[PDB]
Design a protein around this ligand. Structure first.
Ligand SMILES: [Mg+2]
Ligand SMILES: [Mg+2]
Ligand SMILES: [Mg+2]
Ligand SMILES: [Mg+2]
Ligand SMILES: [Mg+2]
Ligand SMILES: [Mg+2]
Ligand SMILES: [Mg+2]
Ligand SMILES: [Mg+2]
Ligand SMILES: [Mg+2]
Ligand SMILES: [Mg+2]
Ligand SMILES: [Mg+2]
Ligand SMILES: [Mg+2]
Ligand SMILES: [Mg+2]
Length: 289
């Protein structure tokens, strides 16, 4: 177990190689996970004047934090929800990246807005160029979206020991959007009907929705039902409860989304996945306050 932090990039990549092989994961998956953790630590330093998070992590990065690399889909985006205007978010991140964290620094590209149907303030996308001790390390796509209903009223705090395993001991603690709101948002996305030039490709959300249902265990579903109502009404598109339809090109997209998850108990076909998620929708709608 390394007693000092990596003295340079080459030492860091070499150490990541060894832990990846020891853990039986793909090197590039572990390296991308570490880049995401670093970006998340920068985001965790962003706080209002009472000390509460300004940014909550969501999406595939959140699921990898909750379940670990072996039990989560491979994803690349670092999706977040902000409680402040994004022009404030970008500058605060750029400040945090210059100061750095445990030898990591980052520079952020300019934010570009994205068109959306159902939120008045459009999300933003930019990239983080990471370096470790002066030398470029990795790039992370970043998406920042605005709060919806109560989806930033609370947060879970997740961790990862990946950097500790390579000799960087500082504690990792990442504020994340809670599961009820992740479910609401993925249920809306996976059932959305997009206009004629576009087509919904989000079969992978059917995998994540199965994973999120498992994470809720025997919890009461009332908070999830409430979150689902709030998001579907907030967006004012298709109504709650939706129909979990599959599109003709989804069979192979869903199969792609299962890559590396053979050891889990998941629906193995897109039809069975849609059936599972439809049962979850009905069970959510049933919950009685
Ligand atoms: Mg706190
Ligand atoms: Mg989500
Ligand atoms: Mg995602
Ligand atoms: Mg996968
Ligand atoms: Mg996002
Ligand atoms: Mg709430
Ligand atoms: Mg908050
Ligand atoms: Mg659809
Ligand atoms: Mg709950
Ligand atoms: Mg559909
Ligand atoms: Mg097929
Ligand atoms: Mg499986
Ligand atoms: Mg069921």
């Amino acid at each position: 177990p390394y007693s000092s932090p990596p003295t340079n990039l080459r030492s860091l990549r070499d150490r990541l190689t060894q832990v990846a092989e020891r853990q039986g994961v793909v090197f590039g998956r572990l390296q991308r996970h570490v880049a995401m953790i670093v970006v998340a630590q920068f985001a965790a330093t962003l706080t209002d004047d009472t000390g509460a998070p300004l940014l909550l992590v969501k999406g595939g990065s959140s699921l990898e934090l909750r379940r670990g690399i072996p039990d989560s889909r491979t994803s690349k985006d670092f999706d977040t929800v902000a409680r402040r205007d994004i022009e404030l978010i970008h500058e605060q991140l750029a400040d945090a990246g210059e100061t750095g964290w445990e030898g990591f620094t980052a520079i952020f590209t300019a934010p570009e807005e994205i068109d959306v149907p159902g939120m008045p303030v459009k999300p933003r996308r930019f990239t983080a160029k990471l370096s470790y001790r002066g030398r470029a390390f990795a790039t992370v796509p970043i998406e920042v979206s605005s709060v919806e209903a109560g989806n930033a009223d609370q947060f879970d705090t997740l961790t990862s020991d990946a950097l500790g395993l390579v000799g960087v001991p500082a504690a990792v603690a990442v504020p994340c959007m809670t599961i009820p709101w992740q479910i609401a948002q993925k249920l809306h996305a996976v059932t959305a009907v997009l206009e004629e030039p576009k087509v919904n490709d989000r079969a992978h959300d059917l995998v994540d929705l199965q994973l999120l249902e498992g994470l809720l265990l025997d919890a009461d579903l009332m908070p999830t039902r409430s979150a689902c109502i709030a998001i579907f009404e907030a967006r004012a598109q298709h109504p709650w409860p939706p129909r979990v339809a599959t599109l003709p090109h989804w069979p192979l997209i869903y199969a792609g989304a299962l890559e590396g998850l053979d050891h889990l108990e998941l629906a193995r076909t897109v039809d069975a996945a849609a059936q599972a998620v439809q049962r979850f929708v009905a069970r959510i709608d049933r919950a009685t306050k």
